[PDB]
Write a protein that binds this ligand. Structure first.
Ligand SMILES: Nc1ncnc2c1ncn2[C@@H]1O[C@H](COP(=O)(O)O)[C@@H](O)[C@H]1O
Ligand SMILES: [Zn+2]
Length: 180
DNA sequence: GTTCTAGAAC
DNA sequence: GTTCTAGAAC
């Protein structure tokens, strides 16, 4: 198929769709994740095209920090009274093109969460904290990731709240209800 | 990334 | 027999 129509290019379409946008400024847009992996799951994307964290440099440091600040503001404005826990961060190896910050509530209560890769992408070192990426760019001038990231996706399923081992996705999803 | 579904795991 | 995972997608 075409390059523009390839599944990996999907964010470039969604980020311009008014029905998916929840916030816009001169630098970034925030959209609802199309397949949210928790009750609240947004993506913050810069208007300017940066393919992934591999292409990030110190010229982008202000922008990365702004993405983070905007993520925090969205949490306050859309979920403030919920007092839920959120994490903000980046997948170590993303699937979709165009740099995007995940802003995600820690209930992980969603039918879109369906497999081990989903779980481990948000709940192991595969999930790079936004603050960590920012500090890495500031100090080293670029984002590097260690070997072994794909193997992390195959780790046994463990609750992020109490660290209990669960044998399957359905059993994990049922266990997570206990932490509401 | 998702959709579908064969066949493994239970 | 049903649940569950994991790989092909031309
Ligand atoms: N067409 C789309 N529009 C909006 N979000 C998407 C689309 N396709 C995938 N996603 C989400 O974008 C994220 C991409 O994850 P990653 O590239 O692994 O950081 C996931 O949370 C997906 O649910
Ligand atoms: Zn637990």
């Amino acid at each position: 198929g075409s390059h523009m129509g390839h599944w990996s290019q999907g964010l470039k379409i969604s980020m311009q769709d008014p029905k998916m946008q929840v916030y816009k400024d001169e630098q970034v847009v925030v959209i609802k994740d199309k397949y949210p992996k928790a009750r609240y799951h947004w993506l913050v994307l810069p208007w300017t095209s940066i393919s992934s964290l591999k292409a990030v440099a110190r010229e982008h440091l202000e922008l990365l920090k702004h993405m983070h600040t905007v993520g925090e503001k969205v949490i306050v404005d859309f979920a403030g009274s919920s007092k839920l826990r959120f994490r903000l961060g980046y997948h170590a190896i993303p699937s979709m093109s165009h740099v995007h910050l995940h802003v995600i509530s820690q209930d992980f209560d969603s039918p879109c969460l369906k497999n081990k890769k989903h779980w481990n992408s948000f709940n192991t070192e595969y999930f790079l904290e936004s603050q960590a990426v920012i500090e890495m760019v500031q100090e080293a001038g670029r984002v590097t990731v260690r070997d072994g990231m794909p193997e992390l996706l195959k780790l046994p399923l463990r609750c992020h709240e109490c660290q209990q081992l669960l044998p399957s996705i359905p059993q994990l999803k049922e266990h997570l209800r206990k932490h509401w």
